[PDB]
């Protein structure tokens, strides 16, 4: 019976939250402000309620401030509001929006969940207990006062499901996802690596609890590009900036970091020390049992003609991955809709096997 | 290898209007006068006649690498 009184008083508090002369004061603030509100740029701040700004041409002025908005929302390199007639600081401007953010932040529910992963069951609980169970259930760690594991390296041969695992963590989540392929840290201008790194982790630390997933980072060392300045003596400095940004100073925060490689032996081991990355997880070519789950799930949504056996396909290649399985399970469908059919026969799989593997 | 020698002979034997252009002449001190000079050359070219433009050394212009900061 607490619903009635609680709802009445809570709605009164919500209507008093909207209940916060007065219109005359709004008109006076509008009188102080000019109508063509010009935009400036801070350079420094002087503590006597007037500071230096910088116009769009370069002219700079010691101007006072119309102090009702929080001026302490502003730092060097900020955007202000200025007048034409006296150039005074009209007030704060909300921040410009947001090409790096909109590019590097995955906004949407991004694909299928753990119902699609093919029989791992042990790697999954490790990445679960490193990201999901810490973040979504932050109650066990209080009991033991143990900080969560920081970094997770996924590695293994190509085709095993690093990308799937990242997408599945990004499915069931509560944090902002940040995706940068590691090959975008090689720029044709000098000194552009550390700028990308500092902007990336600035975005991460300013926005939210987050997951920064950095994929195929091993290609930063074993791929020299002609579209570059002096290669290795800039790449090394970029790696050093990534290093210092990852485990440097000033209370790192609520940022999770997951990285994924093909090869691991060409990495500078200074990233691979603990304190930065605590979990290193192998992804092997699985077995001949969880392959049945992979063929099953990648044939779970199709009109499979039951004259085929999946054990004919398991035995076929001795070191096939889930990449090969997806490739055959889609190429057989491409052979199916080539001849206006619905169900898929055995020779479709035969042609798909002879198309994917041996070409 | 005799590059401008042939444009010289073409300027001699022709009847058409012939406009020589220094390559680096477009980039100048005042802002925006370059594209305006491009407009100038092409408006006069459209005006005159069946005509011939020779622009020497467009390596001053066509450089495949830029820097949109400077």
């Amino acid at each position: 019976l607490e619903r009635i009184k609680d709802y009445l008083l809570m709605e009164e508090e919500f209507i008093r939250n909207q209940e916060q002369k007065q219109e005359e004061e709004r008109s006076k603030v509008d009188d102080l402000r000019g109508t063509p509100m010009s935009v400036g740029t801070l350079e420094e701040i002087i503590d006597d309620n007037h500071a230096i700004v910088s116009t769009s041409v370069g002219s700079e002025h010691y101007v006072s401030i119309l102090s009702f908005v929080d001026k302490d929302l502003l730092e060097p390199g900020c955007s202000v509001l200025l007048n034409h007639k006296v150039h005074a600081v009209i007030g704060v401007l909300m921040d410009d929006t947001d090409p790096l953010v909109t590019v590097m932040k995955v906004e949407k529910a991004p694909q299928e969940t753990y119902a699609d992963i093919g029989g791992l069951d042990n790697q999954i609980q490790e990445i679960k207990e490193s990201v999901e169970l810490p973040l979504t259930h932050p109650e066990y760690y209080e009991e033991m006062g143990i900080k969560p594991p920081k970094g997770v390296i996924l590695y293994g041969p190509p085709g095993t499901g690093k990308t799937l695992l990242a997408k599945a963590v990004a499915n069931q989540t509560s944090a902002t996802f940040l995706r940068v392929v590691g090959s975008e840290l090689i720029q044709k201008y000098l000194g552009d690596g550390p700028k990308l790194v500092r902007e990336l982790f600035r975005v991460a630390e300013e926005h939210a609890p987050s997951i920064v997933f950095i994929d195929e980072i091993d290609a930063i060392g074993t791929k020299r590009y002609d579209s570059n300045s002096g290669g290795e003596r800039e790449i090394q400095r970029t790696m050093l900036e990534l290093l210092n940004q990852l485990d440097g100073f000033d209370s790192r925060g609520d940022v999770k970091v997951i990285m994924a490689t093909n090869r691991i032996e060409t990495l500078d081991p200074a990233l691979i020390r603990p304190g930065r990355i605590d979990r290193k997880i192998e992804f092997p070519l699985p077995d001949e049992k969880t392959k049945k789950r992979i063929f099953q799930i990648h044939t779970s949504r199709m009109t499979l003609a039951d004259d085929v056996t999946l054990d004919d396909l398991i035995m076929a290649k001795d070191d096939l991955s889930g990449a090969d399985i997806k490739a055959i399970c889609t190429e057989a469908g491409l052979m199916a809709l080539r001849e206006r059919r619905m169900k898929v026969t055995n020779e479709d799989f035969k042609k798909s096997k002879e198309n994917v593997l041996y070409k | 290898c005799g590059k401008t020698m042939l444009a010289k002979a073409v300027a001699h034997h022709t009847t058409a209007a012939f406009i020589r252009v220094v390559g680096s002449e477009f980039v100048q001190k005042y802002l925006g006068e370059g594209p305006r000079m491009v407009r100038d050359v092409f408006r006069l070219a459209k005006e005159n006649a069946p005509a011939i433009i020779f622009i020497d050394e467009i390596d001053a212009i066509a450089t495949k690498r830029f820097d949109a900061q400077t």
């Binding site: 001949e288 049992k289 035995m315 001795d318 | -």
Partner: protein, 239 residues
Amino acid sequence: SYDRAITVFSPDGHLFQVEYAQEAVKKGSTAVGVRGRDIVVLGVEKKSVAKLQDERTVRKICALDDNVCMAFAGLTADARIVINRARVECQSHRLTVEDPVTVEYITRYIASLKQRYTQSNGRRPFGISALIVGFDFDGTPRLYQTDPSGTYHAWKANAIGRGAKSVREFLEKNYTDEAIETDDLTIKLVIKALLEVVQSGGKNIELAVMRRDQSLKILNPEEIEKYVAEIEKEKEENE
């Protein structure tokens, strides 16, 4: 010749190539072996055959004497070299002392060769790990394993190859003295251990035994099929 030292110590106290050549063993086929008290048994798993070809040349279990038996892991070529040298050594021992060659001698020879092989000038260490099962005088079954370091090291059951931790964990919860009471049960115990290992289709299950007063018998893969069938029958009888 090649005046160089391939294998250098680490800055933190290792031999890179001895500890690292164990990985080549770690990425080979699995093989177990136990001793009963009167019948010895061993066998390899994961032949990973093409199911449609010859199989008399891929035999991973051989013998050096009429008394001693082999198994290995890792890569097969170094095993071929070590087996050739071991055959020569055991027969040369028979040249001298008129006994049948003791198993402890041939394991010391293999481990000694392996260590002076790792020590020497520019020779790459042997990335294998053998199993040497034999029952010398007065019928005593014993079994030793090797290591790329060269440490002969007597066990009671085996744990090598791929996923040896799982297999030794099954042998850990399966150390029953009852299992080595019935020779047939010891054979079935190897079959159940290797069944708690890989596919174990009854195709790559190559096993050979010796009843210590005979030579090695390679079993025809229909008897192993009935062994797996009665193992599945006992597994149904567990419920």
